[PDB]
Amino acid sequence: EDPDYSLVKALQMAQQNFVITDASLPDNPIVYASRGFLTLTGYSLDQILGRNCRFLQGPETDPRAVDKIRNAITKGVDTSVCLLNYRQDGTTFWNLFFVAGLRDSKGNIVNYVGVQSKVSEDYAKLLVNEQNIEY
């Protein structure tokens, strides 16, 4: 009597840390960001707008994990990855990050919802060792 919603389910596991991108626009730019995301990353909203989320990555980020995210996106499947991200001030944190494509009635991915979440060193070690099972 009440629908399942990939978008709603995602945004509710997101504890006010999320973004929305527009896939129809060049390079999948951010078009909304929650206050939780602003305070987690350290960026202000205007700077965040119209930019691809890759700005959260830095020198130490695992390119292999970025590979998984790029690949998941091109293929239209939802996944989650744990990688090192960077705040506006240069401080780092491990990010268990989930992404889901939103499609129109004709099956075309039109928007993306990203969900970020800081995790402990311990949880991250666990998460990364699982992700590395692929290799």
**Residues of this chain that bind a second copy (CB under 8 A):** 1-9, 11-16, 18, 20, 22, 24, 31-32, 34-36, 78-80, 98, 100, 102-105, 110-111, 113, 115
Are 48 and 35 within 8 A, CB to CB? no
The separation between CA 125 and the C-alpha centre of its own chain, rounded to angstroms, equals 19
Residues 124/94, Cβ–Cβ less than 8 Å: yes
Give the distance from CA 47 to its chain's centroid. Answer: 17
Of residues 63-122, which lie at the interface with ligand FMN (CB under 6 A)? 66, 69-70, 73, 83, 85, 95, 97, 99, 112, 114, 116
From the list ligand FMN, a second copy, none, which binds 73 (C-beta under 5 to 8 Å, kind-based)? ligand FMN
Q: Phi/psi of residue 78, each to 5°?
A: -75, 130
Residue 80 neighbours by CB distance under 10 Å = 17
Interaction pattern, residues 29-58, with ligand FMN; x per rule: CB under 6 A: -----------------------xxx-xx-
Task: Give binding residues for FMN as ranges.
Answer: 52-54, 57, 70, 85, 95, 116
